[PDB]
């Protein structure tokens, strides 16, 4: 589970995609998404 400020899954990012409860995956850019 992706911690706060971690990359939650942009294009190609097959790592931790689900953010910690309370943090939401914010797709900031096509490849950069951050759990906020
Ligand atoms: C949030 O936590 C993940 C591991 O769960 C780590 O890879 C991230 O870098 C961190 O921000």
Curated annotation (Swiss-Prot):
Underlying gene: cbh1
Disulfide bonds: 8-25, 19-35
Protein's UniProt name: Exoglucanase 1
Domain CBM1: 1-36
Function (record text): Exocellobiohydrolases (CBH) that catalyzes the hydrolysis of 1,4-beta-D-glucosidic bonds in cellulose to release the disaccharide cellobiose. The degradation of cellulose involves an interplay between different cellulolytic enzymes. Hydrolysis starts with endoglucanases (EGs), which cut internal beta-1,4-glucosidic bonds in cellulose to reduce the polymerization degree of the substrate and create new chain ends for exocellobiohydrolases (CBHs). The CBHs release the disaccharide cellobiose from the non-reducing end of the cellulose polymer chain.
Post-translational modification (record): N-glycosylated. The catalytic core domain comprises three N-linked glycans which each consist of a single N-acetylglucosamine residue.
Protein source organism: Hypocrea jecorina
Protein family membership: Belongs to the glycosyl hydrolase 7 (cellulase C) family.
Glycosylation-annotated residues: 1, 3, 14
């Amino acid at each position: 589970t992706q911690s706060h400020y971690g990359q939650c899954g942009g294009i190609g990012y097959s790592g931790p995609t689900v953010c910690a409860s309370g943090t939401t995956c914010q797709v900031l850019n096509p490849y950069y998404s951050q759990c906020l």
